[PDB]
Amino acid sequence: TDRVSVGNLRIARVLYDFVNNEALPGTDIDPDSFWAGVDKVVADLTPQNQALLNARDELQAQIDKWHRRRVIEPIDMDAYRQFLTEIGYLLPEPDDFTITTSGVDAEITTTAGPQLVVPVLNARFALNAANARWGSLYDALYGTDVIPETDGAEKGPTYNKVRGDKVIAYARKFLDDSVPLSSGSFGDATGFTVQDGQLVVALPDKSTGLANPGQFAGYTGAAESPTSVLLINHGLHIEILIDPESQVGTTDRAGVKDVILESAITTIMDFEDSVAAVDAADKVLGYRNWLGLNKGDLAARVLNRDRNYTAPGGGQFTLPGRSLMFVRNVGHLMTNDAIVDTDGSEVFEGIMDALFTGLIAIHGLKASDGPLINSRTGSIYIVKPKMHGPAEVAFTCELFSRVEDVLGLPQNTMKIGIMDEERRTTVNLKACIKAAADRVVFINTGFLDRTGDEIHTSMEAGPMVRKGTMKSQPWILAYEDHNVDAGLAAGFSGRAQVGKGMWTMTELMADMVETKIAQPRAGASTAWVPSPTAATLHALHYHQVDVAAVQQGLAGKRRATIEQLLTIPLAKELAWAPDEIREEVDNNCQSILGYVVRWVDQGVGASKVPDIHDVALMEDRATLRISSQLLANWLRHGVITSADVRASLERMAPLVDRQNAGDVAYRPMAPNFDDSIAFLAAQELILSGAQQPNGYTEPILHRRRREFKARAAE
Ligand SMILES: O=C(O)C(=O)/C=C/OC(=O)c1cccs1
Numbered sequence: 166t167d168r169v170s171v172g173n174l175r176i177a178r179v180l181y182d183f184v185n186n187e188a189l190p191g192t193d194i195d196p197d198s199f200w201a202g203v204d205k206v207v208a209d210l211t212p213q214n215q216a217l218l219n220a221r222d223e224l225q226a227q228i229d230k231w232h233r234r235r236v237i238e239p240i241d242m243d244a245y246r247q248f249l250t251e252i253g254y255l256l257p258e259p260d261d262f263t264i265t266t267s268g269v270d271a272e273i274t275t276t277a278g279p280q281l282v283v284p285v286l287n288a289r290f291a292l293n294a295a296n297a298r299w300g301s302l303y304d305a306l307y308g309t310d311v312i313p314e315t316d317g318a319e320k321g322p323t324y325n326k327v328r329g330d331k332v333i334a335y336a337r338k339f340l341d342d343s344v345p346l347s348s349g350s351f352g353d354a355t356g357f358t359v360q361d362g363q364l365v366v367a368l369p370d371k372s373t374g375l376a377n378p379g380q381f382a383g384y385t386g387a388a389e390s391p392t393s394v395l396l397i398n399h400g401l402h403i404e405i406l407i408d409p410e411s412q413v414g415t416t417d418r419a420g421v422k423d424v425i426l427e428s429a430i431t432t433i434m435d436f437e438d439s440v441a442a443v444d445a446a447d448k449v450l451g452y453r454n455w456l457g458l459n460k461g462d463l464a465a466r467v468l469n470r471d472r473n474y475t476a477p478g479g480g481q482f483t484l485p486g487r488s489l490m491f492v493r494n495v496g497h498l499m500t501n502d503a504i505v506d507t508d509g510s511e512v513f514e515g516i517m518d519a520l521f522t523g524l525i526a527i528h529g530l531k532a533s534d535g536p537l538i539n540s541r542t543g544s545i546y547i548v549k550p551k552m553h554g555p556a557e558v559a560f561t562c563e564l565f566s567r568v569e570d571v572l573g574l575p576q577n578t579m580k581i582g583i584m585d586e587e588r589r590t591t592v593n594l595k596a597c598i599k600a601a602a603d604r605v606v607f608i609n610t611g612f613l614d615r616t617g618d619e620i621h622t623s624m625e626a627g628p629m630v631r632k633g634t635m636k637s638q639p640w641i642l643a644y645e646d647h648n649v650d651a652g653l654a655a656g657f658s659g660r661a662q663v664g665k666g667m668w669t670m671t672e673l674m675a676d677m678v679e680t681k682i683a684q685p686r687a688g689a690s691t692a693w694v695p696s697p698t699a700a701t702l703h704a705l706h707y708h709q710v711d712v713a714a715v716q717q718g719l720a721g722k723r724r725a726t727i728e729q730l731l732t733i734p735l736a737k738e739l740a741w742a743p744d745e746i747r748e749e750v751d752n753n754c755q756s757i758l759g760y761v762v763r764w765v766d767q768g769v770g771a772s773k774v775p776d777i778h779d780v781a782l783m784e785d786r787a788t789l790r791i792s793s794q795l796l797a798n799w800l801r802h803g804v805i806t807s808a809d810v811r812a813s814l815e816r817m818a819p820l821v822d823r824q825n826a827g828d829v830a831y832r833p834m835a836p837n838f839d840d841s842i843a844f845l846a847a848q849e850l851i852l853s854g855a856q857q858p859n860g861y862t863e864p865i866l867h868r869r870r871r872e873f874k875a876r877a878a879e
């Protein structure tokens with residue numbers, strides 16, 4: 166082969182070279198000792214990794230059997246819980262405790278604000294995300310539907326002053342609401358000056374300062390005609406840029422050019438569900454971008470530097486110019502042929518990611534080319550997705566411990582952001598947090614995966630409600646509150662993030678600004694956004710809502726019961742007309758085809774995908790988990806027939822084809838369906854859905870993408 170032999174391992178040359186030539190230099194880790202470490206960590210932890218996966222299977226088979234042996238229609242909750250407890254699904258709740266995680270940066274312990282997630286394989290998107298710490302509110306408002314495109318205010322190819330004035334007014338109101346003047350409104354400001362370390366705002370008839378002078382954080386330029394004024398509210402910065410000579414500032418009563426918001430406080434660079442990586446070449450592309458980010462030298466145009474300000478008293482200071490970076494590794498399930506053992510068996514990808522993303526993150530703890538890019542406190546921040554229960558969390562912590570030894574890092578350098586996105590984690594959440602009590606930096610409700618797991622776990626119980634109905638079911642509302650309750654009780658306030666899920670509708674920003682405010686109102690110190698634009702707009706919510714106060718008020722409250730968590734989303738009798746069935750079938754077949762065709766044919770794992778009604782959605786692979794499981798569930802219980810499925814797939818394929826008309830590399834699925842690997846992948850996900858472990862889509866998706874790549878090689 167072309168592989169490199171290290172003990173029992175056979176490592177793809179492209180990976181071996183990348184690590185030796187690019188990742189290792191500058192870390193002071195002995196290369197041979199690194200590789201011996203890899204061989205040993207893989208040998209030592211692989212058995213437990215497999216035992217945990219087998220345990221998921223044993224539990225699911227027992228639950229499957231429990232539903233099948235019973236006829237009683239209304240589920241008996243006392244019996245169901247007793248059962249789950251007996252088999253070891255539902256574990257006892259540990260005594261109260263406080264997390265001890267230390268050496269964590271302020272962006273995580275203290276600051277409440279948006280968290281942006283992007284595919285690590287797209288260098289330009291990663292770079293924009295890293296730079297998304299600051300973003301223009303005017304661009305965010307003018308460019309989206311937050312300012313309605315009513316008659317007269319529609320966007321054209323050139324600047325619409327009517328629309329621009331609405332942008333300015335929206336922003337002035339935000340200022341009054343966030344950093345109130347002692348008297349009057351920012352709407353009537355004519356200028357800004359700094360006198361005796363105090364901000365002075367000129368009104369037409371008078372002058373005034375801030376109602377709370379402490380919100381004045383600094384300025385740039387001369388105190389008597391500053392070029393910008395820096396404010397702070399709820400720990401987040403706001404910067405008013407002053408330039409009468411700008412095309413917007415010329416129209417403005419105070420010569421204001423823009424309002425800049427501190428937006429994406431943190432960013433998660435994603436190796437999991439938003440990317441498609443199925444071999445050594447794909448992993449290396451990902452690792453190389455992550456390396457470029459940590460070394461500060463990624464260029465696709467470059468990483469931003471820190472921002473210089475004058476303090477109110479007159480001294481100099483600096484604020485970070487970049488989003489603090491997490492990396493999301495893959496979870497415990499999949500293997501990847503980047504490394505195989507002597508028998509030819511692939512190595513667990515989660516173990517590999519911990520070794521390589523962790524090695525690479527060392528560069529972010531030291532000076533670039535510039536000061537160090539990432540954690541000044543010395544932490545490496547890893548998001549670990551798709552864990553099922555406390556023993557899997559413990560396994561991840563032990564993995565991190567062993568990697569830390571290989572890398573010569575102090576124990577607990579590698580912190581864990583826990584995804585609460587599987588049912589067995591949800592109902593044992595307190596124990597999961599406890600298992601990582603000295604490493605945990607967040608918990609986050611990954612509601613898409615969680616919905617997928619909800620369907621698969623109770624697959625045998627009966628037909629589930631429609632996909633759109635899931636977001637409002639009792640189980641999910643309880644799941645969201647239970648998550649917050651568990652974090653706060655474990656002492657997360659002031660120590661770790663309590664996070665909520667992704668807003669997926671990229672073009673519906675008026676809707677986002679209107680509804681996503683629910684999340685910090687529910688005590689979430691962060692929530693996910695898919696773009697820098699959405700980060701800037703979501704930042705508005707944290708100025709409107711005092712998350713610290715909200716969390717304080719929620720303390721000690723127990724707002725969800727175990728019974729509510731366990732309420733299966735079974736459809737009621739006679740729930741749907743025949744037309745409603747068909748629309749749901751088409752909805753899910755279109756969602757599957759729309760996502761799968763980009764994944765299999767182009768190796769794209771997140772993008773703006775039009776849904777059946779042409780709404781642009783940007784969802785990771787979990788959306789595929791939901792739709793394929795729901796259709797498998799309906800097929801399993803006689804709601805629809807295999808002919809209904811095939812008919813819908815055949816109906817939706819040409820539509821998806823049309824939706825991709827603006828794409829040079831696209832190739833249509835219709836009408837030669839059986840010649841399209843993507844179409845066959847979509848079909849396989851549905852018809853084999855019930856048989857996939859926990860409904861996971863990766864085994865089929867990865868195989869099909871590999872098949873596609875191999876065909877393209879001929
Ligand atoms: O809910 C889940 O299962 C989860 O992992 C978070 C979902 O995020 C996404 O949809 C993304 C869209 C773009 C980047 S991530």
Ligand SMILES: [Mg+2]
Pocket residue numbers: 438550586611613614787
């Ligand atoms: Mg997920």
Ligand SMILES: [Mg+2]
Pocket residue numbers: 630631634736740
């Ligand atoms: Mg329904």
Ligand SMILES: [Mg+2]
Pocket residue numbers: 711
């Ligand atoms: Mg306030």
